[PDB]
Subunit: 645 residues, 3 copies
């Protein structure tokens, strides 16, 4: 019963040095594994990992559960909730579970059915620090000590490109000059190289201005450079955890493994339908393929019976392994996809605005079976969301909600509270847009964007980005630039001692499951505003990654053109929306928080840019100059026309 420590020294040169200190042996001694992670001995996150004794063999998936508990006392604050007790998880808490779960899930031995829970509690937070990345490491650390079939440690780091330097674990203060904010997690291979496993990045609300003022825009080259910059830190973080584990990790336990199917089922099934299956997979038609792809299942589920009775699940599971094998192989050799597309072909696109009546703005975006409806709502800033969490953010001007109803995929199910993925995809698409939004002063409105995943089969979050851009422009939001997104995939298998890679454009839901890496990129025509990535591959050639990002860029540009046809410049602000033209009695009669702010056009009406094609009509007592849909600008009278203009 002794306390052990280890440190990961983070050297940011001119920006200073900071340390991630790991501790174990003092707190929560009843957990399978426990560790504390401090950022400069100031911010503290405790992580406890536990495992249920009995496996849930009933499930066909590894049951991992990650929970992030924000304790408001870590900020010296008493919860503002009515009951003065922290309750339902904030966005940050949920997004952090995702950041931890993504790289930790695939790190456990396959077939594991025991419930593994990881609880990270934020106990102290310096208001200038970001706890998410401190928590990733603490999560990995406690799990690594738990004596479970887990291949860690996993090192997590945030690198932001601040003034030309990729700073590790930047502070909120340092992020004010960041053109790109990127979280990365990975492991250290037996040969010392770092394998990146997870990436969640974004451009910022500062990017455009900073690039204007001289900084380098976050293009694919820059972003890829950032990924390399994160590796040394991840190695340092991993080495520190390994030193802790070396001193106090429990010995790996003996856990039951649950296979999806035995060999006799696969050999049987393979021998029974392999030919018909590999053939059916060559049908470039939807209903035709699925049809023959059905005859086969039949010829199989009928040829293996009654020999294999009560093993039906193994049959369909083996049917999946075989299909996957066949589909992957065809991509590497024939470079043809399960739907007949080439490795860089995008699915049938359809963009459109004015899809719903009355709403301030709306757009419909379809790509294959993915159909997203985006709807925009503009209100007074008083409607902006108010937050009281561990984040320094207290108000949110741009709000995105992503709904994924069951019938989106022809299913029945609960319709209500948003899942963790609905929060995850919603965030990415929200973050992909934020970089191009006008400022509070240029556009004094709270903006709520809702993406309805009416149809789903091909990256709805990315489709959501395209729908947001158009919907917003349709509503009159003076975006600095349109943003589009694309979901990519990567197949990789070694053909006789040689590894080949094939990057896939706009991957189907199936190609995600059969791929070795899936990454999503969104951005304007100039730079990347968002990037998400996941993979278990032991690193990939720089030439390959860069090639994948470039391919993704191309797709993104093509889409931006299609979107451009739908709408280019912002449309006029809906009459049904509010205006804040600058120029009790009538404040409660004319209806408007009189600088005038009306909740309807027929108010303030019957200097601030009241309208900006051949100039800018700035409000006065308005004027015209041969600003946005609400921007501010010092006005001076140059000439009074005959009519009095």
């Amino acid at each position: 019963n002794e306390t052990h420590y280890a440190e990961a020294v983070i050297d940011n040169g001119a920006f200073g040095t900071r340390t991630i200190r790991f501790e174990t042996g003092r707190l929560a001694r009843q957990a399978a594994g426990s560790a504390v992670a401090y950022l400069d001995d100031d911010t503290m996150v405790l992580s406890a990992t536990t495992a249920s004794k009995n496996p849930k063999d009933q499930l066909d998936f590894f049951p991992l559960t990650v929970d992030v508990e924000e304790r408001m006392y870590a900020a010296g604050k008493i919860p503002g909730s009515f009951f003065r007790r922290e309750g339902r998880p904030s966005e940050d808490a949920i997004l952090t579970c995702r950041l931890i779960d993504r790289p930790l899930r695939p790190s456990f031995k396959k077939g594991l059915r025991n419930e593994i829970q990881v609880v990270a509690t934020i106990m102290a937070l310096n208001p200038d620090h970001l706890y998410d990345v401190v928590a990733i490491n603490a999560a990995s650390a406690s799990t690594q000590l738990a004596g479970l079939p887990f291949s860690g440690p996993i090192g997590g780091v945030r690198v932001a490109l601040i003034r030309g330097q990729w700073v590790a674990f930047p502070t909120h203060t340092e992020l004010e000059d960041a053109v790109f904010d990127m979280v990365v997690a990975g492991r250290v291979l037996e040969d010392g190289d770092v394998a990146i496993m997870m990436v969640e990045a974004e451009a910022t609300e500062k990017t455009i201005q900073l690039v204007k003022d001289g900084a380098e825009a976050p293009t694919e080259e820059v972003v890829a450079a950032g990924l390399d910059a994160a590796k040394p830190f991840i190695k340092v973080l991993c080495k520190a955890q390994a030193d802790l584990a070396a001193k106090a990790a429990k010995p790996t336990g003996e856990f039951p493994v649950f296979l999806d199917y035995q060999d006799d089922v696969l050999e049987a099934l393979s021998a029974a339908v392999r030919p018909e299956l590999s053939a059916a997979l060559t049908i470039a038609g939807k209903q035709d393929r699925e049809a023959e792809l059905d005859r086969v299942k039949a010829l199989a589920a009928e040829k293996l019976l009654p020999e294999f009775e009560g093993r039906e699940k193994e049959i369909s599971a083996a049917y999946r392994a075989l299909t996957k094998s066949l589909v992957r192989e065809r991509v590497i050799a024939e470079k043809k996809r399960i739907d007949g597309r080439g490795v860089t072909d995008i699915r049938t696109l359809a963009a459109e605005v004015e899809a719903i009546p009355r709403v301030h703005g709306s757009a419909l975006f379809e790509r294959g079976e993915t159909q997203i409806l985006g709807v925009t709502t503009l209100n007074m800033l008083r409607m902006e969301q108010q937050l009281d969490t561990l984040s320094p953010v207290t108000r949110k001007r741009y709000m995105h909600n992503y709904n994924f109803p069951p019938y989106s995929v022809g299913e029945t199910g609960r319709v209500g509270s948003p899942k963790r993925r609905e929060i995850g995809h919603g965030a990415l698409a929200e973050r992909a847009i934020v970089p191009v939004l006008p400022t509070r002063e240029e556009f004094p409105y709270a903006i709520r964007q809702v993406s309805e995943a009416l149809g789903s089969n091909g990256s709805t979050s990315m489709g959501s980005v395209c729908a947001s851009t158009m919907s917003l422009l349709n509503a009159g939001v003076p975006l600095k630039a349109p943003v589009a997104g694309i979901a990519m995939g990567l197949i990789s298998q070694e053909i006789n001692g040689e590894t080949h890679y094939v990057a896939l454009t706009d991957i189907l839901g199936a190609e995600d499951a059969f791929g070795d890496m899936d990454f999503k990129v969104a951005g304007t025509k100039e730079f990347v505003t968002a990037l998400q990535l996941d993979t278990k591959l032991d690193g990939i050639p720089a030439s390959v990654l860069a090639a994948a990002l470039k391919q993704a860029r191309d797709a993104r540009l093509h889409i931006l053109d299609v979107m451009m046809e739908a709408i280019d410049t912002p449309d006029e602000m809906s009459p049904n929306a509010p205006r804040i033209i600058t120029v009790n009695q009538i404040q409660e009669d004319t209806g408007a928080e009189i600088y005038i702010g009306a909740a309807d056009g027929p108010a303030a009406e019957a200097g601030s840019v009241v309208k900006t094609t051949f100039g800018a009509f700035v409000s006065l007592l308005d004027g015209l100059l041969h600003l946005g849909v609400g921007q501010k600008v010092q006005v001076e009278i140059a000439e009074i026309d005959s009519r009095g203009k």
Copy 2:
């Protein structure tokens, strides 16, 4: 993959023409069935219907699920909730699910066990339109296209009697002159006649004044006339949906059916106990009947064993079919009920006020095993509920809550959030009362009424109406008139090519299950304030319906007498309640938002009617005139008595 449309033209003559446009093929293509319904191309409701592949054979009831999703952007509003995202369903959403579920549920083939879900989303709403009825049609439309064993289309319409005309799909503007608001849904029979299936109606807060000013009160004759007025519209709505289905409906699928019992069980059971059963059912006594009615189950469940082992459920299920058959038959032939009452006899009534201590007002209403406790609470108007939904209503002065605890029926179970039926019954009883409440000015208090279903077996919502009237009067609420309700039933079977009908007064919970129609009527001595109805019958003779309504009226009048004995005129306003007598320093000392508004009697005290038997004591600096318990009236001094009166 093409978009199809159809239109139902609603002609309201002088009030104008409007259209319900149906669309399909553009949105939510992954759902079994999908359709959009627009009201004048302005208000839009999307409906997606899906079916789970696997039947839930475990259940003994068809698992239908209807969800209504109000999107605040349909109103150009950002949710006011703390999280700025619509969450827990508003009353309207829930009540709308009920309106859709009621006529759609019985339209599916019996024995269906597949989960069928219908999700209606309100995407755009003209603030002058009511979306509920647009949603009923959209729900029916998407389901009709889903390729399910569903006998639609179902047409839903709201007809309100405005200035002598039954206007279809009235607007909030047009409803200001409505004396009756009635929703009706039905189907079109093979012969072209419309079969009404569901009715949810109510008198309004305008009725009394409008009738005063000349309009015709909504009596049974008027109401029945409205029902006929809804038929042509329902035919138009059905024809439009049928035209859509004709163009794009999927072909009916082959679904598994799950019988409650096989013939061998019924023949066996019938042969085994039919005589004893038909005899036991003649026992007019409660415990006696249930006793012999138990000997029989035994003689049965003992005579069919061990022959029928493992089919026990079929036995009791068949035991139900047989009992139902016997009970129904006896009503038609003998006109005697399972409890010994005649077709028009009301159960033992008991009314009483002052049932609970301290509360501002209370009443206890018993009818057979139905026992309702109503409790009244009066507070300042600041306590009136504030709403921010798709409804134009923003504040609710009269609030009704209906609780149905498990022990109400001798059961254990969850005690917490109110079920959809608790909301449904609560609404009806709330709507049955609203028409007779005094106005804000006549009575400046927020009124909360709670009905506790302490005992249940005979229409608790109607019993709730009677309990509300008395409780309110007990509290001093100057109701314009007392309201009473009654639950009716209708048995109908054809005796050799000839159909007979028998209307039942104050039906027991059992007679509801064995009946062919169940309708509830509530109202004052002069008119109907509420009506609810459900049936699968292919329409009934006008003479029969009118007869049923008249019978119901009679019962209602009898009850009003019994209630009158309990209390006639309002009682004095509880001292423990607030007063708003009209006549910082002492505003925060004497305690009262000083026009004076006290939260207790000992405030404002130690022109507005301060008390009104031989006149009206209007506040002054009070006076007496040889108004309600708070009404306003211009006061003038006529004579100063010797004592100074």
Copy 3:
């Protein structure tokens, strides 16, 4: 169908007489059992008890469910919640369920598996009365009439020591002079003596001052005296219920009993391992014992197979009965505990402050495997919780939250809303502290205390008390005195016609399960601030109880010493905390509700005691007098030093 009554006359002499009236037969006639309990015909509580027909044989515990429903109309109030409808249970409601459940649960026959639910509804409440104890009796009454294998009635009473007299059912008015508030519940034995079964007591926020002004401090002697004072009342309450049951109780039904194991399993298991088990239990070492204690289970679970196949559960259940038998026996004879401690030995203690960075105050308390982390947060009074329940309390200055995460015991599980025990333990530890807190005026801050049960195995609520004291002092809260708690146990078995008792100090979780009584005591060095007790014993010798309380006192004093070493006097108030030094323009610039109230130290700074070692630095325009960390005191200048002091 007749209404029956009974009365329990509560005679408080000079304080008056009150009555608890029981009623049955009028309301909720469908429940298995129903009764109303009125306090002076003013406060009313209705209780309905029901039983599910089918036993839940799957469960290994009696499924009792108690629900308390606060109806705001009982207070003539409309719920202030947004939906104007009472929702999630208040603290009082939950704590009341606990008070009712604790004595009612063990009163049912063992092996009972039918779901028994008790719903108590507060329908009317005199604002000067406390409904909790009225509800305990109503709960017992309705259950006693339900015809269940229940050994009631259970009488519940609150006795508070007011001016030297133990007043039964004191009012909020009378409690203003109470030095101790104690709830007690018990039953009447066949011989007429009262057996106390449950106790939930606390000192008050008035204690210290009242003792200062002359009253007698609530020491173990005083407290024990109170327990005797509650007996006559409990007998009166029981007799009244018995009179009601005599008149209307249903006859006891025939319910299925589910044994944990049959005799053949115990005889088999006993014969198979008794020797090795009794021996393994002599191992004073943790891992060593549990190890041998494992060999035994094996030698057993291997010697009874395959003879006992499919009865494994009975084996482990019998293994428990045997272990319990052995452990209890050893305590009585050898006076040695399953962990090797003597009957009065405390587990290894460890106290420490400054355990977490940044937080205003924190402390870590360990006792054996029990590890509690307490964290303190100080904010402006505006952050104090606001309540709108049936309690007269409307604001709460001191808030305690107790978290018990799953990994606290090496388990996985839900992490979110607090269980009823988390509320129960949190309350006790909250109530144990309240008596020593400074007043609003002496300390103008809202105080939130959070106890994290990071490790659990030995009364975490009591460990929570010790952690609170230290954490609070660490934060600078001028407590009047430090408070410590201890969990005790009592083993009692009669050795040949003679009953022996053995009181256990700081019992392990196991000794609680094997004991016959478990009570927790907390308090300062001078008196008891909290006491909790539970037992089924037919009363115990006064000499024994007093001995147990004295032993507990000793332990408590020892702990207070250990805590004293960690911290004695309050530490300086964290700079990161707010100050309210007494001395729009700068009110919104300097940041502080200007009497000055800053949310940070660098505000008000760059008469009220600004700091109080050699005197008290009271704010002025400050001064020094050779008060607390915010107290108020009239300041006068006596002498101006050369430097100007």
